[PDB]
Every structure is written in structure tokens, then in C-alpha cells.
Design a protein around this ligand. Sequence first.
Ligand SMILES: Nc1ncnc2c1ncn2[C@@H]1O[C@H](COP(=O)(O)OP(=O)(O)OP(=O)(O)O)[C@@H](O)[C@H]1O
Ligand SMILES: Nc1ncnc2c1ncn2[C@@H]1O[C@H](COP(=O)(O)OP(=O)(O)OP(=O)(O)O)[C@@H](O)[C@H]1O
Ligand SMILES: [Mg+2]
Ligand SMILES: [Mg+2]
Length: 1154
Amino acid sequence: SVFSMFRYSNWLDKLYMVVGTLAAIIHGAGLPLMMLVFGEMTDIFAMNLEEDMTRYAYYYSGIGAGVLVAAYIQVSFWCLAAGRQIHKIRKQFFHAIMRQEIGWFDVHDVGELNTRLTDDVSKINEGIGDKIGMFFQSMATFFTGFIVGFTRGWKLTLVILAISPVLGLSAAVWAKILSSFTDKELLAYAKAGAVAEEVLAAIRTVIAFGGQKKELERYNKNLEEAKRIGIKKAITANISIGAAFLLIYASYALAFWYGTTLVLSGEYSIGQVLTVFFSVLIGAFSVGQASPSIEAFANARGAAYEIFKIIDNKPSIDSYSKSGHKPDNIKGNLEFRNVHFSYPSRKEVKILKGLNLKVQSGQTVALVGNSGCGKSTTVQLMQRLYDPTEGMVSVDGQDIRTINVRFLREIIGVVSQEPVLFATTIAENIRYGRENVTMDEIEKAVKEANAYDFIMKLPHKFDTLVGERGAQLSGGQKQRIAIARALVRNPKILLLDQATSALDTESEAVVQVALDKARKGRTTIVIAHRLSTVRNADVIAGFDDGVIVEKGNHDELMKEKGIYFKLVTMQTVSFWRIMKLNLTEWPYFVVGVFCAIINGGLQPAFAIIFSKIIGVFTRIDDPETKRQNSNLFSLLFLALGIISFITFFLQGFTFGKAGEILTKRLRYMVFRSMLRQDVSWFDDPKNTTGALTTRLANDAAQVKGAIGSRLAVITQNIANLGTGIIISFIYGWQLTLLLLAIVPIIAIAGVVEMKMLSGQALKDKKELEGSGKIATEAIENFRTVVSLTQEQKFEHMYAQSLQVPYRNSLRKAHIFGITFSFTQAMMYFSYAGCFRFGAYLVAHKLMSFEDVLLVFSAVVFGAMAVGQVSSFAPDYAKAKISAAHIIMIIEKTPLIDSYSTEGLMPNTLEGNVTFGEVVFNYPTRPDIPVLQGLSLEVKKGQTLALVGSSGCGKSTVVQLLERFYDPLAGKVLLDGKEIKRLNVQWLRAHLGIVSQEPILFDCSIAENIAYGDNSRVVSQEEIVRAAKEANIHAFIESLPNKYSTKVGDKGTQLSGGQKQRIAIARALVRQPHILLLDQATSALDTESEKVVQEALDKAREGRTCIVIAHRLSTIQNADLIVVFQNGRVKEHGTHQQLLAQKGIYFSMVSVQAG
Ligand SMILES: Nc1ncnc2c1ncn2[C@@H]1O[C@H](COP(=O)(O)OP(=O)(O)OP(=O)(O)O)[C@@H](O)[C@H]1O
Ligand SMILES: Nc1ncnc2c1ncn2[C@@H]1O[C@H](COP(=O)(O)OP(=O)(O)OP(=O)(O)O)[C@@H](O)[C@H]1O
Ligand SMILES: [Mg+2]
Ligand SMILES: [Mg+2]
């Protein structure tokens, strides 16, 4: 556990840290070393000045040169050691996640990882960089003060030193606590990031059903628990400083008393105590500078727990292992024998209860059965995503468990049940099948898949960017690309899973010929619910209760009159705006700023205290009195001590609490603003689920660190150094002019520092969203990328996007290092200058050296406080850009608004939809005319069927009615009223849709069905009443935990039919006036298809419907049918009228002639 964050440090990284620490000790001694020349001048106080002062000044000019080197070496080296290690952490951690199996993805929540990559790693960067360097600068200063003490003092040093262990232990006690709190706070943010990743993926269903309020308030809760842990961390860290500062001034008071005995004993002089106090007191302020460094390291330690926990884990069925067995001449042989298997998520249920099969080379197997018998499990087992409990899957004699994984997976082509594509060009989607592929092969492969014509018709033919998960293309076209992708591979075993579900009759027909032409050499297994495709296969198989019962040729199974016979028979500007948002918390700043000046301004004042204390010690010549008045001063240190406890704690608590209220305020509004946006906004190439969720975590975290507790210290350092120059202006004279004249040189260096950094961060921020895009793309589609065997390519792609920040991180160190060293060094020369200037003025008798020595002593305490403000600049530069983007997104307003109350909400509705002369284009592709002036009539109590070939604008009508996009020209009238003129939500409350490819949320089944109806308490009796009509009651009832079983991410646990049937239920909870079915019975059984139709037909009257489907048996029943053609509605009417006038409809139905 201990020091497990520095695992990937090279010999050159080691060299940086060792050389940095040695320089850090040398740099820290210089401020303690300045007091040595003062002590000898006090000894002289019991001709001189011009010879003595120049010697002491001459030393300061040399020190400044030593600081300019050491400071650069100190700061620069750690920053390099951080940047290189962080680069290796991100690359290793991502590689570790891809090494996992599917069962691990099934159990744990994958949505948490995306925020663990960007935010949680960035916390470590702050911990193990410059703060480690400064920590040693502080610690050298602390000890080097005592090193003078041992020479100058025998007991006085020991008396102060002996109360170091409390400071030493206290730091360990508070750190170990707040280190534990960090793990729990980060876990709260991870739970929030999962909600954002889920919602932004399925935004269309969220907009459709209109559940923005519920998802917003749920997202809010996770932030509430994060705030409560945050405020606890603030209280703890600020108390750590108060007690430490209290104990030092308390111990200083104890040290004074024994100092009073010098007159009685005669052990040492008053010249000694001034040396001892001036030596030892400097280190007191160094502790306050060290308090942030320990707090950073403790949080950075707390950040590491969960990252290395994933890296330390080892897989079961490893893909990266090269110790497997790989044969040469793989003849086609597949054997199942007595195979039992159950998933990890529900171990109680038994799906496969002993089956067996033999498939020789040159055989196309058909698997038939009802939804739930486990056809997809068999296909998913072949790839070896899960292993069997008993039974052996042997290939060509040898068992799968003995042979190699990667070698096995690169000879199996798989078209999954519901395909998914990656957001790139069409060429790259085809290229994921195999690396070294030529254009000629792709040309041939597409033409076999029958997806050539539409690719030729689109501009940028092979360079058209498909959306996230292939959303921009149609349902049919998307499926063909998956078919091509398998055929480019050219494997031995081909595995089709309902490959011709969304495709029409003509596309199925020609694709069948291409597959059947080049079948002889291959081995094939085909899943299908159409039976015409099943007719010409070699062997058919029937599942039943886990076991495969029936087998054989078409003739035999017909004569045997089993399940197959029944199936065949049945078919027949930053501070001004950002500060203003937190107008409420005004009394926190008033107390915080007031307290910072009082506790900050005490440190330069010591010289005034020490001068008066020294003066009162030698005021009156009489000795007995000195005993009494000296005792009171010791009480004064305790009094300041007890107040110091009150000031520092309150200062830190007031500022610390203020930030945590704002942090949550920033997040809540941005997520609320993003959820208002139009669909057109989500279709932009720049906007993506991964790109957005990264934008949430990064922007808030950048703002939080700059203006939180860290703001407070700067206020203390400004007041300190202000008080320093004020008392220099008051008591001193002709010094401020020489001191202040060097300040513009720091100012010129400061402006060029921020200008170089602030310009750099904008280019860095833009790239990191590009980095985030790939992770969310790879993680969400894990089954695709595992099946395709493309684990390296994504790591290589991920390595590119990280390379541009990596350069900036290295460059940043040198810019930051040069400014620090210069800003630090220019002060020392000023401390040389003032003494040398004092050498001239004292001689001529215009300035009093006794008073000059005090201002010299007073000004030099700020030297460290000057160094604190120098380290602030980068944080301000990153916040400036981060803030601008937040105000940009919040202030933006959409075209069609969901939160606007205005519109017309008519008390009743007749339910008559009309379309007339409608032209429309999508925003992403402006030139292509999808609809070219169509018209359509829909009245109450009627079902209108829409038909045509794949990609003739059927699903566009559904989307146009739901107000995702508005028409360019034309008109839509609801009951003789413009849909633009109506209220937005009001419309979406009445009508309800069933999408082409359903999506579900990570929740219980009851809540997914209850999600359909919002703004009302859904009764359970109605849920079961609906789910009885939907026809999934017996399935849910047989399952353990009833409705409380948690469905997976995007409906991954349940089978297609099971979720698709839920989607049907979710629609029927509302009892809508207008209804829209877009291939609602795509993948369902013949037994189900009737029972689903019965409920619709029995309760058809009253409401209105528009059906889209390829099954002519459904369209047979409908009132009037409509046929599309290149945008124009060519054919329309009733079944007898359309069949009489023998056009395309006759050609469409006659293709099924006997
Ligand atoms: N990853 C999984 N985790 C848990 N249970 C699963 C998983 N995949 C499938 N199941 C369950 O196993 C059973 C069989 O599912 P499977 O999809 O293999 O059957 P199917 O006949 O192919 O379904 P369909 O006909 O709808 O395509 C179902 O009851 C389903 O809920
Ligand atoms: N958001 C979008 N951006 C760009 N083009 C789109 C978008 N949505 C649809 N299209 C294009 O419009 C054409 C037809 O659209 P649509 O998918 O509605 O037809 P469809 O009848 O639903 O097709 P299918 O029957 O194959 O599902 C397709 O070629 C598709 O690429
Ligand atoms: Mg299936
Ligand atoms: Mg469609």
C-alpha cells in the first residue's frame, strides 16, 4: 500500500528527484543564513560601518546568484518527474481495463471509469510535483534555523526544540483522517458521472418521454453527499494549522521565562537571546507554508486506492497471453457435448441444461425456437466470452480451453443481434475487420453485401462520418455495413444473428445469393425468424427447455410433425462574473478578509514587539523591577497564541466553506442547461457523450482548486507584505523608493508568464476532450471491440491524443521555473541594496541605524510570502479559460425550448394529423433532399400504414411529429392548428413512440415501465395490467426477485424480444391519443405476434395509429396504405384499390408468390 504511486519511475526520473531534493536543501538555508551577520553586529554594540557593512552586503549579492541556480533546479526537476509518471499511469491504467473479461464488465458499473481517468488522475498531478519541492525548502529553513541555535545557545535551543514531537505527530493524525475522506468524496463524484454518461447516451428517449426533472434531481443527490464530505475536509485541515501556530507561540512564551534568568545567573547576555529568537522564530512561519503540501500529498495518496486496485487485478481468460496453442490446418469441425452454462449476474437461473451438436465442414446449421431458449448464448459461447460449467467445446478434436484466444477469435466472423458502429468514416468501420485491407477488396465486399448504390449517391463517398453508435444512417444501411465487415474478414466459421431483420424482401434476396454463392468452403450457423431463409439449409435444430430436441432435413421434420411443423403451419472577465454568481455568501468573505489581515499582519509587526521588548529590558537602570514587567510579556505571547487559534481556523473555514457551495452551484446549472438543448446540438461532430462527460468533471475541478481554500493564503501574504511596506513607509524613509523601483521588473516577468501559459492551456483543453471520446467509445461497446479483436489499435489511437498535452506539460516546467527563480533572486539583490544604501545614509547622519535595523528585520520576513504568490499564477490561468466556457454554455438558449411555459394548451383534442407539401433536410447533411414536398392525411379511429424500400424517409415522419427538427418549408396542422404555435411538452405528453432500436436504463423493470408516465404516481396494478397486455408477465413471474431485477446498460441483460416487449409496455402505460410503431415487432415470435396484435386491435377504437413494418400480414389489416418514392408519395389508398391498380404494391406482394 505505502508508496505504490511511484511504481513507474525510471533511472532518469530518480536522477531528477535526488538532484532536486539536494538543491531544495541548499535553497532553503539562505534565509536562515542571513541572520549570522546580524549577530556579530549586536556583539559590536557593547570607521566601522563603511568597512563592516560592505562585507556583509557583498555576501548578499553572491547569495542571489546561488538562489537563481538552485531555485531553477529545485522547481524544474519535480515537474518533469510528475509529467512523465502521469503519462505512464494513464497509459497503463487504460491498458489494464482492456485486459479484463466480460463477466467483470457485467457485474461492475462501467460508467464510473470515465471520470476516474480524467479527474481522479489530475489530483495526483498536484500532489507529486512542485509541492514536494517546496516541502523540503520549508523543512531546510526549519532545521537550519536551529543549527545556528546549537552554536549560539546551549539550553534555549533545546527548550524550544523539545516541543517538536507534537507538531510532528499532529500532522500524521490529521493527514491519515483527511486521506480517508478523499476516497469517499471521489466515490460520490463517480456515482454522479455514471448518471450523466447514461442520460446523454439515450437523450432522444429522455426528450421523447420527457423525464428531465427526475434525472436532474437524482443527479443532484450524489452532489449533496459530496458536499457533506467536502466541508468535513475543510474543518480538519484548518484546525491542523491553528493548533500548530498556537503551540509555537505557546512554546515561545515558555522559552522567554528561562531567558529572564540571565540577570540572576549571569550565564549569557541579552545579545544572545536576540540571536536565538531571530534564528528560531523564522522557522515558525515555514510550518504554515508546509501545511498545504501535506494536505495535497494526503489527497493524492487517497486518490490512488481505486486506480492501482484495477491495475493489480489479473484476468481469467486472458487475450494478451502468448502461451496458447495454435494449429495449422483448421478443417471445419464444431462439437457441443453436454454443455451447462449460467451467467455471473444471475447464478440461480439455469439456461442451458445439457445439449449437444456436431457440425462438419460445408454445413449451414439453422437454430429455431422461442425467445428465451438461448440461441444467442450459443453464438456468444463460441467466441469464448464465458466458459461452460460442465461439458467441453472441442474444435477439430482439440479443446477450446487448451488453444490460444487471439488465434481462435481471428477465424470467426460475427454479425451481432443489434449491430453497433464507431463514430468515424465508413472506410474505418470496414477497416476494423482486418488491418491490411485494400480498396479493391472493400469494393468487392460491399457489392456482395448490397450496400453500393447508396454509398455512390452520398457526397464524400467513403469519407462520410456516421454518428455515435451509427445514429446518422438508417436501420437497414447500418446492418449492411456490419454484414460487409464480416465478409471482408473471410473466416472459417460464420455466425449470423438475425442479419436480415430490418432489411426488406429485395435486399434479403440478393444478399442470400452472395452468401450462398461462396458458402461451400465455409462453415455457417444462421439464426433467423423468417422461415423462407431457413428452407434451403443443411440441418435444422429445435431448442426446448435448454436441450436441443429435434434435428434433420426439412422433409424429416415435416413428417415427424414436431415443433417445426407447428411453426411452419402457423406461418402458413473572470472575477467580475464568477464572483457575482455567489452573491448570497457575503458575510463569509467579510469575516475571512478581516481575519486574514489581522493574523497575516502580525508577522512583520514582531520587529516592533522585539524593539520595544529589547528597549524595556534596558529602559530603567534599577534591577528588581525587570522581574515583574518581563513576566507580563510572556502572558502577551499566550494571548496572541489563543487568538491565533481563533483567526486561522475561522479564516480557512469561511473561505473553505464558500467554495464548496459554489462548486455544486456551477455543476447543477451546467447539467440543467445542457439538458435544455435541441437535438440538432447533439448531432454536431464536436459534441459526444465522452466529450461532454469529460467537460463536466474537468471544468469544475479546474475552478475549484484555484478559488477555494487556496485563495485564503494569498490574502494573508498580501496583507503581510503590505504591512511590511507600510511600517517601512512610516518608521523608515528613503527605502521604499529603492525597494518599490525593483517591483515593475517582477511585473513585466509576471505578465509574460501568464500570457504564455494561458495561450497554451486552450490548445491543451481542446485535445483532452478528443482523448476522452475514445475511452467512452471503447468502454461502452466492449463486446464489439472484444469480438473484433481490436484492442491495440484503440490504445494506439488513445496514445496520440495524449501526446500533445505531454509536450505542454514539459514546456510548462521551464516557464514556471524561470519566473520563480528570477522573482526570488531579484529580492535578494534588493536586500543587498538596502544594506548598501544604509551604509551611505548612516554615515551622513540622516537616518537612525537602530531604527534602520528594525525595518531590515521586518522586510525580510516577507521574502517567503513573495514566493507563495509566485506559485499561484498557473492555477489562475487554467481557471480563466475554464470559467469562460461555463458562462458560455449557461447563457445560451435553444430554438425549441422545453422549459418555456408559453404556447397554447387546448382543453380538448380531436386527434387529426395532417401533412401538406413538406420539404425537410437534416442539419448534418444540408445538400441531400430526404423529403421533397410530401402530403398525408390522418383522421381519428384509423390505422395508416407506411411502406417502401430501405431508406425512403419512413422514420423521419415520426421525428418530425415529435418536434426534434422543424421543416424548411411546408406545414403541419394538429386539429387545424400549427404545431409551432402549440406548447412543446403538452404535445409530447399526449402522443407516444416506440423507437426502431429500443434502449433502457440501469434500473428495475417496474421503474422502466413507470418511466413512460411522468408527473403522476404510477400504480403497480396498472403496471401489471399493461405488462399483461404486452405479454411478458409469465417471464417476469418465473424469474426470481419479480420486477426488482436490475436490467443492464442499454438493455444488455435481457434478450432483444424481452426488452422490445418492455418498450411496447412502456408506451401502453400512457394510454396515448396518437401512437407510432416503427418496426415494433421486428424480433418476436409467431405466438407473441398474435397476442401483441390482439391488445392493439381490441382497443384500437378511440386512438389513432401509424405503423411502419415489412410484414404484409399486419398491413393486410390496416385501413389505408401509403407508398414512398424518392420523397414523393406515389401510391396511396385501400387494399382493394391499390391491388386493383397494379403498380409497385402488386410487385411488392407478388414477390411472395408460390
Ligand atoms: N449477459 C446476460 N446476463 C444475464 N442473463 C442473460 C444474458 N444474456 C442473456 N441472458 C438471459 O438468457 C436467456 C436467453 O437469452 P438469449 O438472448 O441467448 O436467447 P435468444 O433466444 O437468443 O433471445 P431472442 O430470441 O430474443 O434473440 C434470457 O432469458 C436472457 O434474459
Ligand atoms: N440525423 C440525421 N443526419 C443525417 N442524415 C440522416 C439523419 N437521419 C436520417 N438520415 C438519412 O435519411 C435517410 C432516410 O432516413 P430514415 O432512416 O428515416 O429512413 P427509414 O425509412 O427509417 O430507413 P430504414 O427503413 O432503412 O430504417 C437515410 O439515408 C439516412 O442516412
Ligand atoms: Mg438472441
Ligand atoms: Mg427507420
